């Protein structure tokens, strides 16, 4: 709509799925993608690093119309994929962006953590 060119990209990995949303210098999201956004179904789409890759690109390409060029990447959460590929899951997204055409100014890990909300199950703790 209204060219921005410089902005932020938030990569939110999880064991389930990857969702990336690009934003303005301000923080208001330009566009967003995920594995679901692309037509890929729940298990594979969601997590698969491949998916993360596709989602990353879709996010950038869509943002390209917005006139996006440079972006700061923020990584939140850890997650990946089951896939045979190395599938860090998060990394692929970080990669797809660097390649997508946008110049990535920086990668930053700001995974949130609770002070200590509630007990995790899932064999955690």
């Amino acid at each position: 709509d209204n060219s921005q060119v410089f902005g932020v990209a938030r990569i939110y990995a999880s064991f389930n799925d990857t969702f990336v949303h690009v934003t303005d210098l301000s923080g208001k999201e330009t566009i967003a993608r995920v594995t679901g956004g692309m037509k890929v179904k729940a298990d594979r789409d969601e997590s698969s690093p491949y998916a993360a890759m596709l989602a990353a690109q879709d996010v950038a390409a869509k943002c390209r119309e917005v006139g996006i060029t440079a972006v700061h990447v923020k990584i939140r959460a850890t997650g990946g994929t089951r896939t045979k590929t190395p599938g860090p899951g998060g990394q692929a997204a970080l990669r797809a962006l660097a390649r997508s055409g946008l110049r990535i100014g920086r990668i930053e890990d700001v995974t949130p953590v609770p002070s200590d909300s509630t007990r995790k199950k899932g064999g955690r703790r």
Binding site: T83, K84, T85, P86
Partner: protein, 150 residues
């Protein structure tokens, strides 16, 4: 690989090495004679049906038949992806010649006491003057496979 490339004596009729190679492809059981005859007779077939000189027709055929890119399997972290790759110039000829003879054998037409017509027809069909026939198909198919998995 199998061994160092041995140089081949050029063809008695037209002293072209490539021709001998083709002849070798045709021959089996070391019946070198029958093999040479089939190729020669085909060349005669190329002369009548087609105004062009056989030697030119054949070479053009091989060109159409040589695959530029082929896909080779490789094991990546997951699954074996088929990596596309160039083909050696040496490799391309062996594939082209081999594919011609195979496709030629493929043809229904059983002409001449032997195979000789199938070779004659196959080569013309190959030419890109006529770039059709079973030989070209394989060639086109491989290239298509490659760059599919670019």
């Amino acid at each position: 690989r199998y061994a160092n490339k041995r140089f081949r004596k050029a063809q008695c009729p037209i002293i072209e090495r490539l021709t001998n190679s083709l002849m070798m492809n045709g021959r089996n059981n070391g019946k070198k004679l029958k093999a040479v005859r089939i190729i020669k007779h085909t060349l005669d077939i190329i002369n009548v049906l087609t105004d062009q000189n056989p030697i030119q027709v054949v070479v053009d055929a091989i060109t159409n038949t040589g695959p530029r890119e082929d896909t080779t399997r490789v094991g990546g972290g997951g699954a074996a992806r088929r990596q596309a790759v160039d083909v050696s110039p040496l490799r391309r000829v062996n594939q082209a010649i081999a594919l011609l003879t195979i496709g030629a054998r493929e043809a229904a037409f059983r002409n001449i006491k032997t195979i000789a017509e199938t070779l004659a027809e196959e080569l013309i069909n190959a030419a890109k003057g006529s770039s059709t026939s079973y030989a070209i198909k394989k060639k086109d198919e491989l290239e298509r496979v490659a760059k599919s998995n670019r």
